[PDB]
């Protein structure tokens, strides 16, 4: 039976009947609601006594890292600053059929929150949050990252990177923590989200946004590391996200890519109920295979080497919950992850106005890390340049798939270049990476800019 909650009709991205939705009712009708799954929101806290959250609240999925106590209750202020985690929690697991607000995507999942943004957010704070109770929490949702000013290059420092590797390796009984991540809100600053090391990570399942009418929202950042898309806000004729709000209220104006990641986390919760044995990599495969480009407008939809349409705004397209839970049920676990390291340069290369580096690779032929079926690929680049934001960088796979690694960033005046920065693309997923790869570095300005590429490491992940 369809939810009876008073605002469920306003949750157009779930309740729609016009095919502009996330196809969640189809998963609910297959019997999947999130029962037995545990999700945690890493944000500014969670109103655990909210009438639409209390029934699913899980103290075992929660902690207060900012004040160092178990209780993630938000700090109440006159401007309601610390409401975001409560909004995101309801998107995932707001209680259903209780006469309050609407429902969560996974309305029978258990939901917690980590209060970790309301304070000085250090590497240690991030690590302690990403690493919370990793054999109880299945899925983490994080909407935060480095400043979206269009001039920052930053990512997880050592403790947080260690937390990512521990989570995916030993978390969830060795199946791997699922870290769902928002790709950013820096669109009007012309931000380019591979410059955000959290969303650019292979260990995060990164999500962008589409407006109700199927367009790229003003706030969206394009990048090759994004995997897929959920609906969120757009212009003032387009509806927004409807969910739980601070002070036991219900909001119809939750917005941004930061509202897209929680919806993805709920869909992933339904999928994990359908197959509890999925690994962190399995889950990314399911997203790649089932997501839907149709009716998302972008001028960069390109067909990759295995016939999938991919966009830097949308990844593989809109998440499809019904298809995710269906494919999950008989999914065969992927083979162990291989990693093929190819150091490319024999000498430093002057960049000048334009540099092209071509290299034919065997992808570790004859070795235990031989890869014929790519998952993520990275170009780890070390270079100097006098104005970083004038650079644009592309990587072309042997199958001809052109991934933008970096778009021009007008505000990025930095003279510090890139220091072994691991630009990541999802767009060659399932391609055979043997053959010629091409790296393109271009000065997009008319200025006489200058610099040097001193290291190019092609890193291939995948299977055979
Ligand atoms: N790189 C990131 N992950 N940026 N995360 C940003 C973020 C995260 C949470 C809340 C707010 C945020 O940004 C402000 C904002 C909200 C909505 C809109 Cl529509 C625009 C901006
Ligand atoms: C989970 O997958 C692994 C790897 O394929 C397999 O060995 C194991 O039996 C599976 N467990 C369950 C409960 O299906
Ligand atoms: Ca507290
Ligand atoms: Ca409700
Ligand atoms: Ca950004
Ligand atoms: Cl690695
Ligand atoms: Na990611
Ligand atoms: Na192509």
Q: Residue 305 CA: which ligand is closest?
A: 8
Q: How far, in Å, CA of 358 to CA of 338, rounded?
A: 23
* Angle between helix 84-93 and helix 257-274 axes, rounded to 10 deg: 30
- Selected catalytic residue, list 84, 138, 254, 394: 84
Q: How far, in Å, CA of 251 to CA of 434, rounded?
A: 50
Q: How far, in Å, CA of 91 to CA of 110, rounded?
A: 12
Q: How far, in Å, CA of 362 to CA of 334, rounded?
A: 22
Closest atom, ligand 1, to C-alpha of 148: 1
Say if strands 178-182 and 204-210 run parallel, antiparallel, or are unpaired. Answer: parallel
Alpha carbon distances (Å) from 284 to 165, 341, 373, 442: 16, 22, 14, 31
Altogether, the residues listed in the chain come to a count of 464
Q: How far, in Å, CA of 59 to CA of 110, rounded?
A: 9
Closest atom, ligand 2, to C-alpha of 333: 5
Provide the resolution (angstroms): 1.8
User: Residue 104's closest CA among 205, 32, 44, 182?
Assistant: 32
Q: How far, in Å, CA of 417 to CA of 438, rounded?
A: 20
Contact between residue 270 and residue 106 where contact means Cβ atoms under 8 Å apart: yes
Method: X-ray
383: left (phi over 0), alpha (psi -120 to 50) or beta: beta
- Selected catalytic residue, list 220, 225, 258, 311: 258
CA of 298 to the centre of ligand 7 (A): 21
Question: Ligand 2, from 333, 334, 335, 337: best to mutate by most atoms within 8 Å of Cβ?
Answer: 333
Alpha carbon distances (Å) from 429 to 42, 165, 250, 426, 456: 28, 21, 40, 6, 21
User: Residue 198's closest CA among 172, 227, 216, 225?
Assistant: 225
**Collapsing DSSP states into helix, strand and coil, what is residue 47?**
coil
Alpha carbon distances (Å) from 324 to 39, 228, 290, 443: 18, 13, 6, 41
Whether residue 136 lies in the annotated active site: no
Q: How far, in Å, CA of 226 to CA of 199, rounded?
A: 7
Q: How far, in Å, CA of 438 to CA of 449, rounded?
A: 22
Question: Ligand 2, from 277, 278, 280: best to mutate by most atoms within 8 Å of Cβ?
Answer: 277
CA of 132 to the centre of ligand 2 (A): 25
The count of C-alpha atoms lying within 13 angstroms of the C-alpha of 421, restricted to the half-sphere facing its C-beta, is 24
**Collapsing DSSP states into helix, strand and coil, what is residue 360?**
strand
User: Residue 227's closest CA among 7, 424, 432?
Assistant: 424
Provide the token pair at 216: 């790229």
Contact between residue 261 and residue 141 where contact means Cβ atoms under 8 Å apart: yes
Nearest 5 degrees, angle CA 44-CA 92-CA 107? 135
Q: How far, in Å, CA of 271 to CA of 266, rounded?
A: 9
The count of C-alpha atoms lying within 13 angstroms of the C-alpha of 22, restricted to the half-sphere facing its C-beta, is 34
Backbone break loci in the chain, preceding residues, C–N > 2.5 A: none
Q: How far, in Å, CA of 289 to CA of 277, rounded?
A: 18
Q: CATH assignment of 338-463?
A: 2.60.120.260
Whether residue 430 lies in the annotated active site: no
Contact between residue 437 and residue 345 where contact means Cβ atoms under 8 Å apart: no
The domain segmentation of the chain, as residue ranges, is 8-329, 338-463
Q: Residue 207 CA: which ligand is closest?
A: 7
**Collapsing DSSP states into helix, strand and coil, what is residue 280?**
helix
Closest atom, ligand 2, to C-alpha of 277: 1
* Angle between helix 158-170 and helix 123-130 axes, rounded to 10 deg: 10
Long-range contacts of 307-311 (CB under 8 A, 24+ apart): 308/429, 308/430, 310/401, 310/426, 310/427
In the chain, the N- to C-terminal Cα span, in Å, equals: 44
Contact between residue 148 and residue 185 where contact means Cβ atoms under 8 Å apart: yes
CA 286 to chain centre: 14
Residues annotated in a binding site for Ca(2+): 5, 52, 64, 69, 71, 95, 98, 100, 102, 148, 191, 221
As beta bridge partners, residue 69 has 64
Whether residue 84 lies in the annotated active site: yes
Question: Under CATH, which architecture does the 8-329 domain have?
Answer: 3-Layer(aba) Sandwich (3.40)
């Amino acid at each position: 039976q369809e939810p009876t909650d008073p605002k469920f009709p306003q949750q157009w991205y779930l309740s729609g009947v016009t095919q502009r939705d996330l196809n969640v009712k189809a998963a609910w009708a297959q019997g999947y609601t999130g029962h037995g799954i545990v999700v945690s929101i890493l944000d500014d806290g969670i109103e655990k006594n909210h009438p639409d959250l209390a029934g699913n609240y899980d103290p075992g999925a929660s902690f207060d890292v900012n004040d160092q106590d178990p209780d993630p209750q938000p700090r109440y202020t006159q401007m309601n600053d610390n409401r975001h985690g409560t909004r995101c929690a309801g998107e995932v697991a707001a209680v259903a059929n209780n006469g309050v607000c609407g429902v969560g995507v996974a309305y029978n999942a258990r939901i917690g929150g980590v209060r970790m943004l309301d304070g000085e957010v250090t590497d240690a704070v991030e690590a302690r949050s990403l690493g919370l109770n990793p054999n109880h929490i299945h899925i983490y949702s994080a909407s935060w990252g480095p400043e979206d000013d269009g001039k920052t290059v930053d990512g997880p420092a050592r403790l947080a990177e260690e937390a990512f590797f521990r989570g995916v390796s030993q978390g969830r009984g060795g199946l791997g923590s699922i870290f769902v991540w928002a790709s950013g809100n820096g669109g009007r600053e012309h931000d380019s989200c591979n410059c955000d090391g959290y969303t650019n990570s292979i260990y995060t399942l990164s999500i962008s946004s589409a407006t109700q009418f199927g367009n790229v929202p003003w706030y969206s950042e394009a990048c090759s590391s994004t995997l897929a898309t959920t609906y969120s806000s757009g212009n003032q004729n387009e509806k927004q996200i409807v969910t739980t709000d601070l002070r036991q209220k219900c909001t119809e104006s939750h917005t941004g890519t930061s509202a897209s990641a929680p919806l993805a986390a709920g869909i992933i919760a339904l999928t994990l109920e359908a197959n509890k044995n999925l690994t962190w990599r399995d889950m990314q495969h399911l997203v790649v295979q089932t997501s839907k480009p149709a009716h998302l407008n972008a001028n960069d939809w390109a067909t990759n080497g295995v016939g999938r349409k991919v966009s830097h705004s949308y990844g593989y397209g809109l998440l499809d919950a019904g298809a995710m839970v269906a494919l999950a049920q008989n999914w065969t676990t992927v083979a162990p992850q291989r990693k093929c390291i190819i150091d490319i340069l024999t000498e430093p290369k002057d960049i000048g106005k334009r540099l092209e580096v071509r290299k034919t690779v065997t992808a570790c032929l004859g070795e235990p890390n031989h890869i014929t079926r790519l998952e993520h690929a990275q170009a780890r680049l070390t270079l100097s340049y006098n104005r970083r934001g004038d650079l644009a960088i592309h990587l072309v796979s042997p199958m001809g798939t052109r991934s933008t690694l970096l778009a021009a960033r007008p505000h990025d005046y930095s003279a510090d270049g890139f220091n072994d920065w691991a630009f990541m693309t999802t767009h060659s997923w399932d391609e055979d990476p043997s053959g010629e790869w091409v790296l393109e570095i271009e000065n997009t300005s008319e200025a006489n800019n200058y610099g040097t590429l001193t290291k190019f490491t092609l890193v291939l992940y995948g299977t055979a």
